[PDB]
């Protein structure tokens, strides 16, 4: 099975997937994120951050408090299962993580932690 996804977006900052299924037979999984816009990361930063659905609010809130210089993630946040760098126009990043960190049946969310974005830039992730 495929163990990679490419996440891409609009000129209007709309992204092309809101649900990711990680196949159980994957040993690693890769997310490729690319920025579709014209603005730099301090104005329109994008990242892809994975946590349990339960942890998403805490990660987002603490990330906002941490600020741009920390890519809007609290340092040493063990709630974060995997994530990309915060990227801006013309940039891309990839993250590969260990699928053994996921549990079948647990509910996961991926989201952007740039302030205010997570209500729009988010989706589910499932190990199946
Ligand atoms: Cu965003
Ligand atoms: Cu990190």
The rounded Å distance from CA 128 to ligand 1 centre is 26
> Distance, CA 124 to ligand 2 centroid (Å)?
20
Q: Can you tell me the distance from the alpha carbon of 70 to that of 75, in angstroms, rounded to the nearest whole number? A: 7
CB 72 within 8 A of CB 47: yes
Task: State the Rg of the chain over Cα.
Answer: 14
CB 18 within 8 A of CB 123: yes
Signed CA dihedral, 75, 79, 83, 86: sign only: negative
Are 62 and 77 in contact by the 8 Å Cβ rule? The answer is: yes
CA of 14 to the centre of ligand 1 (A): 9
Ligand nearest to the CA of 113: 1
Cα distances (Å, whole numbers) of residue 28 to 24, 31, 71, 85: 10, 10, 24, 18
Going from the Cα of 106 to the center of ligand 2, the distance in angstroms, rounded, reads 21
d(CA 3, CA 27) in angstroms, rounded, equals: 8
Using DSSP, state whether 71 is helix, strand or coil: coil
Give the method used. Answer: X-ray
Find the 25 Cα to ligand 1 centroid distance in Å. 30
* Phi/psi of residue 60, nearest 5 degrees: -65, -45
Q: Which residues pair with 109 in a beta bridge?
A: 51, 124
> Which ligand sits nearest to residue 76's alpha carbon?
2
Contact 81, 51 (CB under 8 A): yes
Q: What angle do CA 119, 49, 35 make, to 5 degrees?
A: 80
List of domains in the chain: 1-128 (2.60.40.420)
Distance CA 63, CA 61 (A): 5
Residue list, CB under 5 A from ion ligand 1: 46, 112, 114, 117, 121
Residue 118 CB contacts under 8 Å (≥ 6 apart), including other chains: 56, 60, 111, 112
Q: How many CB atoms lie within 10 A of CB 38?
A: 11
Residues 6+ apart with CB under 8 A from 110: 20, 31, 48, 49, 50, 122, 123, 124, 125
CB distance 69 to 86 below 8 Å: no
């Amino acid at each position: 099975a495929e163990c990679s996804v490419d996440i891409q977006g609009n000129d209007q900052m709309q992204f092309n997937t809101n649900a990711i299924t990680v196949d159980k037979s994957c040993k690693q999984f890769t997310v490729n994120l690319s920025h579709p816009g014209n603005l730099p990361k301090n104005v329109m930063g994008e990242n892809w951050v994975l946590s349990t659905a339960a942890d998403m609010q805490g990660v987002v809130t603490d990330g906002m408090a941490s600020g741009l210089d920390k890519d809007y993630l609290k340092p040493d946040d063990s709630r974060v299962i995997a994530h990309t760098k915060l990227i801006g126009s013309g940039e891309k990043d990839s993250v590969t993580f260990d699928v053994s960190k996921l549990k079948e049946g647990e509910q996961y969310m991926f989201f952007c932690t740039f302030p205010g974005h997570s209500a729009l830039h988010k989706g589910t992730l499932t190990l199946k």
